[PDB]
Each structure stands twice: as structure tokens, then as C-alpha cells.
Amino acid sequence: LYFQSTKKSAAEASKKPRQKRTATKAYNVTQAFGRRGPEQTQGNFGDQELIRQGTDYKHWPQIAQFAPSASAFFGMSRIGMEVTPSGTWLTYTGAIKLDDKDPNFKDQVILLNKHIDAYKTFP
Amino acid sequence: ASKKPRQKRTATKAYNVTQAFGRRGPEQTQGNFGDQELIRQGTDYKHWPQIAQFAPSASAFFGMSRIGMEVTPSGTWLTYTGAIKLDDKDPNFKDQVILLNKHIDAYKTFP
């Protein structure tokens, strides 16, 4: 059920297009999506545990409930296309509303805030 | 179909893009993507798979994006922004550019 990263398995995982990668303990968030940080187009989400575990994180389902389906991604978002010296890029922005009538709402807010910009508190 | 929270809905002919995700338009909380055909068909659209190849996995959505939380008078919102690179070595790259051009801000020309 759980694997360790090897250069071998990392080289296979990395063949997927970025947007279709799945981070796991064997191919962690940093490996799949780059170091967390403040820059534009750099990811900022994940504390040390989530970074190391990806979708093996024990509370992953409570984060994943907020990730959009392909239909909703293209349906909800503002989509743009930019051509630059690095290539052609599909840009996306949007927002997903949390349901504040869910009795779990306060816990959802706390879990999301725990990972947003967590990288600032560790190397 | 509409029982699902917004972000988990799947548009089809039976429950189309406007029904699931609202009218296309310019404001920040609206979507801007899809011509009249995609809007009416959703994931039944004939070229849906060629669009869907750019949508992120759940892991990639939380891994690539800049994620925020904003409390506004309407509610608490999980904000997201990012960019996905097209593979310009893919022999289908030209067609992908054409396909995306057809749907981005297509609403601007609707009667």
C-alpha cells in the first residue's frame, strides 16, 4: 500500500504531464509539483506532512472534497492562454465556496488554513 | 446531478454548463470558457477529451496552484490560481491552440 521513493519509480512518475501527476509517499509534492513558495505560479499549499505524503496523507479526502472535477474546472474558472518565451500556458483562476451550514465547516477551514503558506515556517 | 457541491458537478446534455456553473461572462466569480455547443453539451461535447486533458488531478490542483482563503459577505471561499504548460512538442499542439481559442471568452460573440 505504501512505497518509498527511488530514482527509478520517480523517473516513471515524472513522465506524466504535470497537471495529471499524483503525489504519494513515493513521489512527494516537491518531486511532482516543485518546492512550495511565494512566487507567481509556484504552489503554496502543504505543511511538512502533506508535502511528504501527498495523496497518502491521512486527511487527504477532506482536502480532495474541494478539488474540482474536469467539468467544474473548465466551468467555474477564468481561463486564459498566454504565449511567452517559455511556451504556451493555460492560465486559470477561480474560487470555491465552502458550505458554512455543514457542521464540519469550522474543521474544514482549520484544515485548509493549516496547509496554506505553511512552507514559511520550515526550510 | 445538482445535488453535488458545485466543484464536483459534471455538465452533460441533461445538466448543461449554464445549469451547473452559471452563465458565461466577464466578472470574477463567473466562468468564461465555452462556446454555445460546449455549453449545451458539457462532457458530451465531441472534443471534450481534448479539453479535459488540461484539467488538473486533485493532487495537481492542490500541488500546482496558489491557494488562498477569503471571508467575504457571501461566504468563505477557497481561492485558486495557476498555469498549466501546453506540450509544444505534441503533434496535436496546433489543434489544441485552435480548440482553446474557440472556447475562451466565446460568450462575447453569442447573439
Residue numbers in the entry:
A (entry chain B): 242 to 364
B (entry chain A): 254 to 364
Authors' description from the paper:
N contains an N-terminal domain, involved in RNA binding, and a C-terminal (NCTD) involved in RNA binding, protein dimerization, and interaction with the viral membrane protein (M). The SARS-CoV-2 NCTD folds into a helical core with a protruding β-hairpin employed for protein dimerization.
The electron density map is well defined for the three GTP molecules, which present temperature factors that increase from the guanine moiety to the phosphates, suggesting that the guanine is well anchored to the protein and the phosphates are more flexible. One side of the guanine ring establishes a π–π T-shaped interaction (edge-to-face) with the indole ring of W330 and hydrophobic interactions with K338. The other side of the guanine ring stacks over the guanidinium group of R259, which makes hydrogen bonds with the OH– groups of the ribose ring. These interactions suggest high specificity for guanine, as other nitrogen bases have not as many favorable interactions as the guanine. Importantly, the C-terminal tail of the symmetry-related dimer also contributes to the GTP binding, covering the cleft as a lid, with Van der Waals and hydrophobic interactions between T362´ and the ribose and with the π–π stacking between P364´ and W330.
